[PDB]
């Protein structure tokens, strides 16, 4: 797809707001630290590429937008930080959505779609049920929120297929 400006490490988009959820106290939770946000199965180097990333990334971001925008999780974050989240995803969504129209091919496979889409829905579904048990206390959202950072990390870097992290 059309490159924005050479290859960069981070995205500098939505990473700032995510950091705001790092001030939490480590004493909030311990055994409640899991990763159900970013499906690593799809984000792993087992079979991940630039175009392919657009497939998973799109669903990953689109889902996050619905999480807060649904009012449920929105009430969890400050209206200021939350409201910014809506626009933040929009910028990233356009990047992927644009590739869809480009007719690259990776975002057309009716069968491959399930593997990419399901990977996000399956993991994203855990977060909904996971938080339900805690009724959105504070750490439950942090563990899931902080997890989003990883999805953004490998998403815009793994494509290069250069060095991972075990």
Which of 63, 42, 54 has the alpha carbon at shortest distance from 2?
A: 54
The method recorded for this entry reads NMR
CB neighbour list of residue 54: distance below 8 Å, 6 or more residues apart:
1, 95, 96, 99, 100, 104, 106, 107
Q: How many Cβ atoms sit within 10 Å of the Cβ of residue 6?
A: 5
Name, in order, each residue with C-beta under 8 angstroms of 69's C-beta and a sequence gap of 6 or more.
Answer: 86
23 alpha carbon, distance to own chain's centre: 20
User: Are 14 and 89 within 8 A, CB to CB?
Assistant: yes
Q: Containing H/E element for 109?
A: none
Separation of alpha carbons 154 and 41, rounded Å: 12
Count CB neighbours of 38 within 10 A. 26
Q: d(Cα 63, Cα 69) in Å, to the nearest integer? A: 10
CA angle 125, 164, 126 (to 5 degrees): 10
The structural domains of the chain, with segments of one domain joined by +, span: 1-166
CA 89 to chain centre: 9
Counted residue by residue, the chain has a size of 166
Place of tokens 């129209």: 101
Q: Which residues contact 93 (CB under 8 A, 6 or more apart)?
A: 58, 61, 62, 65
Nearest to 39 by CA among 28, 47, 30: 47
The CATH code belonging to domain 1-166 is 1.20.1250.10
Q: How far is CA 128 from CA 1, 46, 134, 140, in A?
A: 33, 27, 10, 10
**Vertex 89 angle, CA 97 and 122, to 5°:** 80
Q: DSSP assignment, residue 157?
A: T
Structure-token pair, residue 110: 């009716």
132 DSSP 8-state letter: H
């Amino acid at each position: 797809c059309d490159l924005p400006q050479t290859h960069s490490l981070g995205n500098r988009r939505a990473l700032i707001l995510l950091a705001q959820m790092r001030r939490i106290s480590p004493f909030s939770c311990l055994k409640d630290r899991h990763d159900f946000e970013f499906p690593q199965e799809e984000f792993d180097d087992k079979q991940f590429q630039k175009a392919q990333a657009i497939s998973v990334l799109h669903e990953m971001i689109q889902q996050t937008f619905n999480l807060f925008s649904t009012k449920d999780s929105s009430a969890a974050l400050d209206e200021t930080l939350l409201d910014e989240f809506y626009i933040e995803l929009d910028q990233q969504l356009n990047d992927l959505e644009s590739c869809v129209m480009q007719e690259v091919g990776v975002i057309e496979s009716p069968l491959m779609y399930e593997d990419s889409i399901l990977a996000v829905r399956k993991y994203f579904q855990r977060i909904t049920l996971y938080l339900t048990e805690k009724k959105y206390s504070s750490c439950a959202w942090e563990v899931v929120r902080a997890e989003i950072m990883r999805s953004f990390s490998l998403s815009i870097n793994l494509q290069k297929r250069l060095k991972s992290k075990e």
